[PDB]
Scaffold this active site. Structure first.
Site, PDB file in Angstrom:
ATOM      1  N   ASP A   1       0.822  -1.226   0.000  1.00  0.00           N
ATOM      2  CA  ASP A   1       0.000   0.000   0.000  1.00  0.00           C
ATOM      3  C   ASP A   1       0.845   1.259   0.000  1.00  0.00           C
ATOM      4  OD1 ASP A   1      -2.276   1.540   0.095  1.00  0.00           O
ATOM      5  OD2 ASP A   1      -2.701   1.197   2.229  1.00  0.00           O
TER       6      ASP A   1
ATOM      7  N   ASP B   1      -1.757   5.055  -5.915  1.00  0.00           N
ATOM      8  CA  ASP B   1      -2.020   4.185  -4.759  1.00  0.00           C
ATOM      9  C   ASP B   1      -2.135   2.730  -5.223  1.00  0.00           C
ATOM     10  OD1 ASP B   1      -2.702   3.038  -2.382  1.00  0.00           O
ATOM     11  OD2 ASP B   1      -4.625   4.094  -2.132  1.00  0.00           O
TER      12      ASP B   1
END
Lengths: 340, 6
Positions: free
Chosen positions: A32, A212
């Protein structure tokens, strides 16, 4: 030296194997760049060894699609051949949204950690990348990520490289852009970009947003999503929660062109669709076209107006450069794939 | 799907 770790495509996210402790237990952590706390405990229990140490803090993170809370520890973390003694990690006693993983590998910027500890609400938590660099292991403070399209449920077709780029994972050259000055995108791996559809249709005017790995879809501000639905002819679909196109509308689907760092990046028609042999993974039916461009759920002008997610990064190599506070992107041999 | 620290 720099070092790499393979990463596995789980369709909605990528994971890497991460050892924790001595002797190390392996946990599968979600990669992440949109958060910065490394934590485990969503599946396997935390195995405490002699390298585990308690801290004075609890920890809590809220995400778009879930959350966790627990207690902060330090421990030895292993990523491929790299070892980080005394990495601060979270250990969840509560978690939601983490089916399929043990937790998160938090490779967002360290500023996102401020506020996550209690009672030390102003204290930051150096990330795995920061620690690899400050301990002298990697030669510059950088992470480079390779994702690739998939036609299997679980394909180890990705790579993280700490401290260097891997030229076997991209074509042409890397374009860099500074982290945006616009808040709140500036707290993440935030950049400025614009998006157009085909040659003549604006989708998203130049604005700020983030890159992301831990957002599945390529999300755009609601007003831009309405423009995209109009331009493609797409309609909402029940069974998936994705936009759907007819056969004819897919045949007519044009590229989305992202302008980043003065260069054009072309997200092709095939890159805009979910892998059709895996349509059942999202509740869809076979021989049907579902789109991976989604609605961010907020209008443009809020200082964070898009998320270039996993489905975008399956087509572009990305470089998260902390030392220079910049983000790089490059084409790959899969940018023009038609495997979806 | 997921949307990771809004």
């Amino acid at each position: 030296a720099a070092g790499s770790v393979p990463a596995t495509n789980q369709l909605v996210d990528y994971v890497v194997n991460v050892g924790v402790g001595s002797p190390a237990t392996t946990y599968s952590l979600l990669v992440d760049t949109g958060s910065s706390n490394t934590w485990l405990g969503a599946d396997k229990s935390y195995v405490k060894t002699s390298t585990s140490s308690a801290t004075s803090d609890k920890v809590s993170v809220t995400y778009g699609s879930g959350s966790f809370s627990g207690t902060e520890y330090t421990d030895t973390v292993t990523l491929g051949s790299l070892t980080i003694p005394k990495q601060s990690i979270g250990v969840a006693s509560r978690d939601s949204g983490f089916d399929g993983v043990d937790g998160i590998l938090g490779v967002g910027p360290v500023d996102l950690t401020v506020g996550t500890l209690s009672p030390h609400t102003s204290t930051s938590i150096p990330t795995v990348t920061d620690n690899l660099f400050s301990q002298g292991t990697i030669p510059t403070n950088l992470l480079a990520v390779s994702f690739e399209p998939t036609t299997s449920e679980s394909s180890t077709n990705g790579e993280l490289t700490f401290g260097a780029t891997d030229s076997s994972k991209y074509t042409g050259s890397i374009t860099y852009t500074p982290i945006t000055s616009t808040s709140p995108a500036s707290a993440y791996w935030g950049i400025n970009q614009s998006i157009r559809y085909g040659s003549s249709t604006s989708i998203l005017s130049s604005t700020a947003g983030i890159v992301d790995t831990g957002t599945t879809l390529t999300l755009i501000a609601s007003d831009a999503f309405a423009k995209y639905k109009k331009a493609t002819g797409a309609v909402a679909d029940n069974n998936t929660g994705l936009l759907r196109l007819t056969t004819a509308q897919y045949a007519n689907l044009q590229s989305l062109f992202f302008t980043i760092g003065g260069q054009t990046f072309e997200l092709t028609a095939n890159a805009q669709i979910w892998p059709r042999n895996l349509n059942t993974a999202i509740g869809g039916s076979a021989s049907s076209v579902y789109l991976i461009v989604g609605d961010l759920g907020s209008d443009s002008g809020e200082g964070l107006d898009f998320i270039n997610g996993l489905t975008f990064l399956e087509r572009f190599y990305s470089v998260y450069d902390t030392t220079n506070k910049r983000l790089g992107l490059a084409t790959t041999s899969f940018t023009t794939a038609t495997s979806n | 799907x997921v949307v990771x620290a809004x």
